[PDB]
Write an enzyme that holds these catalytic residues in place. Structure first.
Site, PDB file in Angstrom:
ATOM      1  N   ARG A   1     -74.031  -9.353 -13.368  1.00 24.73           N
ATOM      2  CA  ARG A   1     -73.030  -9.726 -12.397  1.00 24.73           C
ATOM      3  C   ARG A   1     -73.369  -9.148 -11.020  1.00 24.73           C
ATOM      4  O   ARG A   1     -74.058  -8.150 -10.895  1.00 24.73           O
ATOM      5  CB  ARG A   1     -71.620  -9.344 -12.873  1.00 24.73           C
ATOM      6  CG  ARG A   1     -71.439  -7.926 -13.383  1.00 24.73           C
ATOM      7  CD  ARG A   1     -70.138  -7.797 -14.174  1.00 24.73           C
ATOM      8  NE  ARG A   1     -69.657  -6.412 -14.236  1.00 24.73           N
ATOM      9  CZ  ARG A   1     -70.077  -5.506 -15.120  1.00 24.73           C
ATOM     10  NH1 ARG A   1     -71.019  -5.821 -16.024  1.00 24.73           N
ATOM     11  NH2 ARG A   1     -69.574  -4.270 -15.096  1.00 24.73           N
TER      12      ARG A   1
ATOM     13  N   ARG B   1     -73.600 -14.439  -5.880  1.00 27.21           N
ATOM     14  CA  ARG B   1     -73.817 -14.904  -7.264  1.00 27.21           C
ATOM     15  C   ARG B   1     -75.168 -15.563  -7.430  1.00 27.21           C
ATOM     16  O   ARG B   1     -75.800 -15.423  -8.476  1.00 27.21           O
ATOM     17  CB  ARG B   1     -72.723 -15.871  -7.693  1.00 27.21           C
ATOM     18  CG  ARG B   1     -71.306 -15.298  -7.618  1.00 27.21           C
ATOM     19  CD  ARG B   1     -70.306 -16.391  -7.927  1.00 27.21           C
ATOM     20  NE  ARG B   1     -68.900 -15.982  -7.921  1.00 27.21           N
ATOM     21  CZ  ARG B   1     -68.116 -15.976  -6.844  1.00 27.21           C
ATOM     22  NH1 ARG B   1     -68.600 -16.314  -5.652  1.00 27.21           N
ATOM     23  NH2 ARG B   1     -66.826 -15.628  -6.947  1.00 27.21           N
TER      24      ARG B   1
ATOM     25  N   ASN C   1     -72.877 -16.594 -13.970  1.00 32.26           N
ATOM     26  CA  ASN C   1     -73.200 -17.020 -12.609  1.00 32.26           C
ATOM     27  C   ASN C   1     -74.699 -16.991 -12.236  1.00 32.26           C
ATOM     28  O   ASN C   1     -75.462 -16.205 -12.821  1.00 32.26           O
ATOM     29  CB  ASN C   1     -72.392 -16.181 -11.633  1.00 32.26           C
ATOM     30  CG  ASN C   1     -70.963 -16.628 -11.538  1.00 32.26           C
ATOM     31  OD1 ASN C   1     -70.686 -17.836 -11.349  1.00 32.26           O
ATOM     32  ND2 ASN C   1     -70.038 -15.673 -11.641  1.00 32.26           N
TER      33      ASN C   1
ATOM     34  N   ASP D   1     -61.156 -21.059  -8.673  1.00 31.87           N
ATOM     35  CA  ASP D   1     -60.999 -21.115  -7.219  1.00 31.87           C
ATOM     36  C   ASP D   1     -59.762 -21.912  -6.890  1.00 31.87           C
ATOM     37  O   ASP D   1     -58.937 -21.482  -6.068  1.00 31.87           O
ATOM     38  CB  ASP D   1     -62.202 -21.776  -6.570  1.00 31.87           C
ATOM     39  CG  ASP D   1     -63.509 -21.147  -6.977  1.00 31.87           C
ATOM     40  OD1 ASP D   1     -63.900 -21.400  -8.134  1.00 31.87           O
ATOM     41  OD2 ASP D   1     -64.111 -20.386  -6.169  1.00 31.87           O
TER      42      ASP D   1
ATOM     43  N   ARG E   1     -56.657 -20.038  -7.730  1.00 39.97           N
ATOM     44  CA  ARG E   1     -56.457 -19.069  -6.661  1.00 39.97           C
ATOM     45  C   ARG E   1     -55.818 -19.707  -5.442  1.00 39.97           C
ATOM     46  O   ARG E   1     -54.837 -19.167  -4.870  1.00 39.97           O
ATOM     47  CB  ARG E   1     -57.777 -18.372  -6.279  1.00 39.97           C
ATOM     48  CG  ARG E   1     -58.204 -17.289  -7.257  1.00 39.97           C
ATOM     49  CD  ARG E   1     -59.684 -16.944  -7.180  1.00 39.97           C
ATOM     50  NE  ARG E   1     -59.968 -15.687  -7.867  1.00 39.97           N
ATOM     51  CZ  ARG E   1     -61.159 -15.332  -8.336  1.00 39.97           C
ATOM     52  NH1 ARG E   1     -62.185 -16.148  -8.173  1.00 39.97           N
ATOM     53  NH2 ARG E   1     -61.317 -14.165  -8.992  1.00 39.97           N
TER      54      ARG E   1
ATOM     55  N   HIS F   1     -69.002 -22.882  -7.086  1.00 41.51           N
ATOM     56  CA  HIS F   1     -68.207 -21.677  -7.373  1.00 41.51           C
ATOM     57  C   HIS F   1     -68.840 -20.511  -6.635  1.00 41.51           C
ATOM     58  O   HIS F   1     -69.562 -19.700  -7.199  1.00 41.51           O
ATOM     59  CB  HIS F   1     -68.090 -21.420  -8.875  1.00 41.51           C
ATOM     60  CG  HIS F   1     -67.320 -20.168  -9.225  1.00 41.51           C
ATOM     61  ND1 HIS F   1     -66.021 -20.002  -8.914  1.00 41.51           N
ATOM     62  CD2 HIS F   1     -67.736 -18.974  -9.819  1.00 41.51           C
ATOM     63  CE1 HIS F   1     -65.617 -18.776  -9.321  1.00 41.51           C
ATOM     64  NE2 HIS F   1     -66.674 -18.140  -9.846  1.00 41.51           N
TER      65      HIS F   1
ATOM     66  N   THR G   1     -64.033  -8.496 -12.032  1.00 42.66           N
ATOM     67  CA  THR G   1     -62.883  -9.366 -12.314  1.00 42.66           C
ATOM     68  C   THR G   1     -62.907  -9.791 -13.786  1.00 42.66           C
ATOM     69  O   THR G   1     -63.966  -9.819 -14.428  1.00 42.66           O
ATOM     70  CB  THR G   1     -62.832 -10.594 -11.367  1.00 42.66           C
ATOM     71  OG1 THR G   1     -63.517 -11.682 -11.953  1.00 42.66           O
ATOM     72  CG2 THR G   1     -63.459 -10.278  -9.997  1.00 42.66           C
TER      73      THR G   1
HETATM   74  C1  LIG Z   1     -80.835 -11.975 -24.379  1.00 41.81           C
HETATM   75  C2  LIG Z   1     -79.430 -11.544 -24.116  1.00 41.81           C
HETATM   76  N1  LIG Z   1     -78.429 -11.926 -24.872  1.00 41.81           N
HETATM   77  C3  LIG Z   1     -77.230 -11.387 -24.408  1.00 41.81           C
HETATM   78  C4  LIG Z   1     -75.966 -11.584 -24.965  1.00 41.81           C
HETATM   79  C5  LIG Z   1     -74.860 -10.982 -24.391  1.00 41.81           C
HETATM   80  C6  LIG Z   1     -74.988 -10.176 -23.266  1.00 41.81           C
HETATM   81  N2  LIG Z   1     -73.833  -9.549 -22.722  1.00 41.81           N
HETATM   82  C7  LIG Z   1     -73.496  -9.418 -21.431  1.00 41.81           C
HETATM   83  O1  LIG Z   1     -74.205  -9.791 -20.499  1.00 41.81           O
HETATM   84  C8  LIG Z   1     -72.137  -8.805 -21.205  1.00 41.81           C
HETATM   85  C9  LIG Z   1     -71.910  -8.456 -19.752  1.00 41.81           C
HETATM   86  N3  LIG Z   1     -71.875  -9.645 -18.911  1.00 41.81           N
HETATM   87  C10 LIG Z   1     -70.727 -10.088 -18.359  1.00 41.81           C
HETATM   88  O2  LIG Z   1     -69.615  -9.692 -18.715  1.00 41.81           O
HETATM   89  N4  LIG Z   1     -70.890 -10.981 -17.377  1.00 41.81           N
HETATM   90  C11 LIG Z   1     -69.773 -11.710 -16.806  1.00 41.81           C
HETATM   91  C12 LIG Z   1     -70.215 -12.609 -15.685  1.00 41.81           C
HETATM   92  C13 LIG Z   1     -69.052 -13.125 -14.869  1.00 41.81           C
HETATM   93  C14 LIG Z   1     -68.231 -12.246 -14.185  1.00 41.81           C
HETATM   94  C15 LIG Z   1     -67.169 -12.708 -13.432  1.00 41.81           C
HETATM   95  C16 LIG Z   1     -66.880 -14.059 -13.365  1.00 41.81           C
HETATM   96  C17 LIG Z   1     -65.744 -14.551 -12.515  1.00 41.81           C
HETATM   97  C18 LIG Z   1     -65.854 -14.072 -11.055  1.00 41.81           C
HETATM   98  C19 LIG Z   1     -67.163 -14.510 -10.437  1.00 41.81           C
HETATM   99  O3  LIG Z   1     -67.503 -15.680 -10.403  1.00 41.81           O
HETATM  100  O4  LIG Z   1     -67.878 -13.527  -9.990  1.00 41.81           O
HETATM  101  C20 LIG Z   1     -64.698 -14.552 -10.214  1.00 41.81           C
HETATM  102  O5  LIG Z   1     -64.775 -15.514  -9.470  1.00 41.81           O
HETATM  103  O6  LIG Z   1     -63.632 -13.838 -10.383  1.00 41.81           O
HETATM  104  C21 LIG Z   1     -67.697 -14.938 -14.052  1.00 41.81           C
HETATM  105  C22 LIG Z   1     -68.770 -14.478 -14.794  1.00 41.81           C
HETATM  106  C23 LIG Z   1     -76.239  -9.968 -22.694  1.00 41.81           C
HETATM  107  C24 LIG Z   1     -77.344 -10.580 -23.275  1.00 41.81           C
HETATM  108  S1  LIG Z   1     -79.013 -10.502 -22.795  1.00 41.81           S
END
Ligand SMILES: Cc1nc2ccc(NC(=O)CCNC(=O)NCCc3ccc(CC(C(=O)O)C(=O)O)cc3)cc2s1
Ligand SMILES: Cc1nc2ccc(NC(=O)CCNC(=O)NCCc3ccc(CC(C(=O)O)C(=O)O)cc3)cc2s1
Ligand SMILES: Cc1nc2ccc(NC(=O)CCNC(=O)NCCc3ccc(CC(C(=O)O)C(=O)O)cc3)cc2s1
Ligand SMILES: Cc1nc2ccc(NC(=O)CCNC(=O)NCCc3ccc(CC(C(=O)O)C(=O)O)cc3)cc2s1
Lengths: 329, 330, 330, 329
Positions: D96, D103, D135, D163, D166, D190, D245
């Site tokens: 993130r 993004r 993203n 969006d 919001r 987005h 978020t």
């Molecule tokens: C080979 C591999 N397999 C795996 C399998 C699992 C994992 N696991 C993780 O990656 C867990 C952590 N990742 C996480 O939680 N990402 C969320 C992204 C996010 C955050 C916020 C918004 C909304 C936001 C915005 O658009 O920014 C807004 O508008 O509010 C949208 C998207 C890693 C690997 S590696």
């Protein structure tokens, strides 16, 4: 065309994944329908009956409320092709009992109706679960099972689900506790020979019988037997006052449909085959606590019955086989 | 006692319900409203009132038997309006219904006579209530409830065109292959033959249908969208002709309004209120316009921008309804 | 102004909410409580309070941004308890949480000092609220809240063993292949290592598991059901070891209690209340027993029929708690 | 055995009918999970991640709340076999953005992760819809589409659903009206190049722009343009305050899951291919209003945009392609 000026179509049919059919648009079938729609259990609801105008008008009335629902397709026909690919088909059709008349008195008229309904249901949804609501429900579930040819797990009778809910309502009112927290089971026939299992009656795991060994018997100073008598008489009283019952059975049926559609595996007192339990050796059906899920009744809870309770159940089972005996179909 | 052996009472409490709803009339509509309200968890107490004692007790009892499956811990009924005490919302569904080929406007003298009894009795026991009128002619009966109750206008709401607009959106949705939630469109004015479809506001995703087809809703319309409004006007009589009455859709529409009032949502509905001041209307006419609906009833009115023809239609509706109001004797 | 061109206002409402909930603390637990409450439509206003201002505003905004998907029309936050005014329910999740291996009782002085500031501020703005304590040691902290508030005992409630019992019912459900809704069983006493599984009450469909297996819950138990209660006790620790904290289950459990409270359901829950007068407890000890929970909080307690061993285990759980409790400074 | 003393098994064990998988148990992933559980959309929920402890802890923490839910099976594993027969798979995994990072700078990290995740998901769930949340969502929907071999209708980006929510919140806040009755579309990326469609913004069908022609321009005395600026800055602002978020995206994703699972055919602003609209010539994905149901995106609504709105959208398209053309996988 205005539609094509507004929308670009990228993909053309539409086959439903969680479709429920109600057969019968009397007050019971429509209570079931509205309850099912309002619990968001289906992506398609189908209604069937033999009176065309009634059926179309009920359908349209429901469709007008579509803005307030999350079931995007409501259909109806006298033709059973409308029921195809149902996961669950609820049968509410048949004669209903008059004021002062036993449900057992409806048996032959509803069996003949079932001789028509059930093959037509099976033809278009050979893999559905059948939920029988029509009375006498226990015998009609046996009949549905024999006519359908389905394995027993998939032919479910609404049974004593309502009887038990009424018992818990009345117990709740007595104790000043919500029915969800008052536990008690009514088993056997849905009707006059139902068996209140006083041994299992409890709040927070506290056996009411341990506090009053006379609970439910004639010796009971608090006369809890009347609670079961009120359960037995409930339909009769409601019939007398408003002419019929609809709302509680609609909620009760929507409760069982919720367990089936969402694979919950909750326990309900509903009609299933009890050959093998409590010395019963025939193809009798009656309510025992069953585990209910996506495949119908998968398991039965073996309730430990006192000789009195066991006797009364023996008797319920006897009353029913007495009628089921003579049936041909 | 077994209760005392099982339960130690720790609190003597004479508690009033906090979210009580009353439904006056246990005909098919009143009970459709009831079941819808109970399955939406809107109320902590439901009171039912009617004049036919047996039918009333039976309906009550049938709902009570469903209590395990619900989240409304007290359902009660009586002929006596004391049972309605401390209601937040009182829905009035009582009265004569129109026969096939009878206008809702022909129900006026019969339903007024009945409202003369019901309304004073109902407001007597509930200082905090909003009045939701469902009985027909709903617009005139909302005016009549307002005059008889002496409530301020924010508190006396007619179910109005909420169902008309719901039907419009269903039919629009069927035409476009889109859910009625995403199909937008407003039918205003009388809940009846003089209602007005607001073509200028009809839209999917903010895209005006009239802007794509400027003939929308006129006789020149090749897609004949005016027939959708016709079908809306004709809906009650089509269903009445088939099953004898309507119940489910108005029950769901009333529940929708109940939800906005009980949950203070401040959503916008087309419902019956006083329009004196708008569109050149200078008389005390009640009819449907988009209103903001909440815990104090209608707090605000949306001023819809009507084309000169839509405005003339709304004033024609207003004129019709006003003429009937001149027939009233209090 | 656009607002005024679009909308005509009818009245100035007080806007005082009817079903307001406040969650104090915006840690993982408080936020889980918040989103579960929002998603169960229990409240018409939700208020958050914490001391870290940035975190507090961020959480509030993040919930606000989803309002389209909710039916809670006002979500507010501040470090100032003016924002909690007129709450019906105030849920306190604030305070230190146990690290891996650390006992809940080790939190007591820290969380007591925090409650010295919180509890008088809550009372000043919502003198008629029900207080629901989630912070640990919950049994002691509910007493502390109770003493500080000057509230009657009905309106000061601890989350207690509600969660512990749910864990028990889950694990039982998993062993029997039955939904937890249909598997019944009670864990009472301290919310922690000294909780008591009531084996006599463990049942499915009213059929006693101990009746089928007399050695149920003992060291003799062929199936070792004692391990189920052991798993309950260890649950928090195992989750903390894996993800650093717990949140979802307690969030759900707290919203379950909020539902009974806000909707006056009178369901029975194993939550903390003063059990002075039961089981030979003569002191002001708060611990979990089955309570009837409604709009006035805990109005009644169910007298559970404990075995001599069960009653002892609870008298012990009691004694432990009053040891620390008696000697608190506030 | 106690289970057997208690229960007679009548039927040998089960494939789920309404299974949902969330890949990634970060804050967003778990927000999606709890929101989906509280909307009763699934009969089974699978979680997948690569951090073993965290994964088990989150599954366990959700399971302990089972009593309060109606989803009877919650499972997790690093192995994608646990995801079999999903009807919906939601991808939330990936890096993130930092505070002050676009993004769009996540693209090489998150494309590399999708090269592993997507073939594994599709291996085990050949009927699923893929809901992309990671993203940059619009480019990652394209990526998942090219990797999967799925038809474009079944590869959905959560896009601008958030969006627009919001926008609608902020609008409602200004007008004293619930968001549900405040309509307004934010389309395109987005991210920072999203496009408010002022022309469509209305209450009860009343165009706000018609009432105030300067709506959304610098001439606007009320500066409604700052509403869209707040939409654009929302993520940044919330990340600045709480570190990330989770809730709004969780609810926005649950909203799309509901339309898909319940075949609602509601209209959402979500990522799909726009090649052949507004003169875009390349395989660009971005948000436009789409009808969403059991087969994913079946239809696109052609929004009539003002020339400046259209330019702004073409500009958003251009930005997205400039990142997309240089992509290797
Ligand atoms: C080979 C591999 N397999 C795996 C399998 C699992 C994992 N696991 C993780 O990656 C867990 C952590 N990742 C996480 O939680 N990402 C969320 C992204 C996010 C955050 C916020 C918004 C909304 C936001 C915005 O658009 O920014 C807004 O508008 O509010 C949208 C998207 C890693 C690997 S590696
Ligand atoms: C060849 C043919 N195909 C068809 C197809 C459709 C129809 N249509 C109908 O028959 C509709 C009318 N019938 C109806 O609605 N019966 C409902 C029975 C009922 C009543 C009350 C309870 C609950 C009650 C109790 O148990 O008494 C309690 O406990 O409260 C349960 C069941 C006829 C035919 S003929
Ligand atoms: C002194 C007294 N106190 C009382 C107290 C109670 C009662 N009780 C009843 O009167 C019960 C029967 N009444 C009934 O059910 N009326 C329903 C009217 C109705 C029907 C259909 C629609 C929707 C329809 C449409 O608009 O036509 C469409 O569009 O679908 C709306 C409204 C009588 C009295 S007398
Ligand atoms: C003067 C001041 N005013 C304030 C105002 C606000 C705040 N805010 C915070 O303190 C936020 C951080 N605190 C936090 O979130 N604590 C959660 C406690 C917790 C954790 C886990 C469980 C469940 C668990 C178990 O029972 O152990 C199980 O069984 O799973 C229950 C309870 C600080 C102050 S200081």
């Amino acid at each position: 065309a205005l539609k094509d000026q507004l929308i670009v179509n990228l993909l053309k049919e539409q086959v439903p994944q969680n479709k429920i059919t109600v057969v019968g648009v009397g007050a019971v079938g429509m209570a079931c329908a509205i309850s099912i729609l309002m619990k968001d259990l289906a992506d398609e609801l189908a209604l069937v009956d033999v009176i065309e105008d009634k059926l179309k008008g009920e359908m349209m009335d429901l469709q007008h409320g579509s803005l307030f629902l999350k079931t995007p397709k409501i259909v109806s026909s006298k033709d059973y092709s409308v029921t195809a690919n149902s996961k669950l088909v609820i049968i509410t059709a048949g004669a209903r009992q008059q004021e002062g008349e036993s449900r057992l008195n409806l048996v032959q008229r509803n069996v003949n109706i079932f001789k028509f309904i059930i093959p037509n249901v099976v033809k278009y949804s050979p893999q559905c679960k059948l939920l029988i609501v029509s009375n006498p429900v226990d015998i009609l579930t046996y009949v549905a099972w024999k006519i359908s040819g389905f394995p027993k797990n998939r032919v479910i009778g609404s049974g004593c689900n309502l009887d038990s809910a009424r018992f818990r309502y009345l117990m709740g009112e007595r104790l000043g506790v919500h029915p969800l927290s008052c536990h008690g089971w009514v088993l056997g026939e849905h009707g006059d020979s139902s068996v209140p299992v006083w041994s299992g009656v409890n709040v927070a795991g506290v056996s009411l019988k341990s506090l009053n060994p006379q609970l439910g018997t004639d010796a009971d100073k608090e006369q809890w037997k009347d609670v079961h008598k009120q359960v037995v008489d409930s339909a009769y009283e409601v019939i007398k006052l408003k002419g019929y019952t609809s709302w509680a059975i609609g909620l009760s049926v929507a409760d069982l449909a919720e367990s089936i559609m969402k694979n919950l595996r909750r326990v309900h007192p509903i009609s299933t085959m009890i050959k093998g339990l409590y010395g019963i050796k025939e193809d009798v059906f009656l309510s025992v606590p069953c585990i209910l899920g996506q495949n119908g009744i998968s398991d039965v809870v073996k309730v430990t019955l006192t000789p009195d309770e066991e006797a009364r159940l023996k008797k319920s089972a006897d009353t029913l086989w007495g009628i089921q005996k003579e049936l041909q179909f």
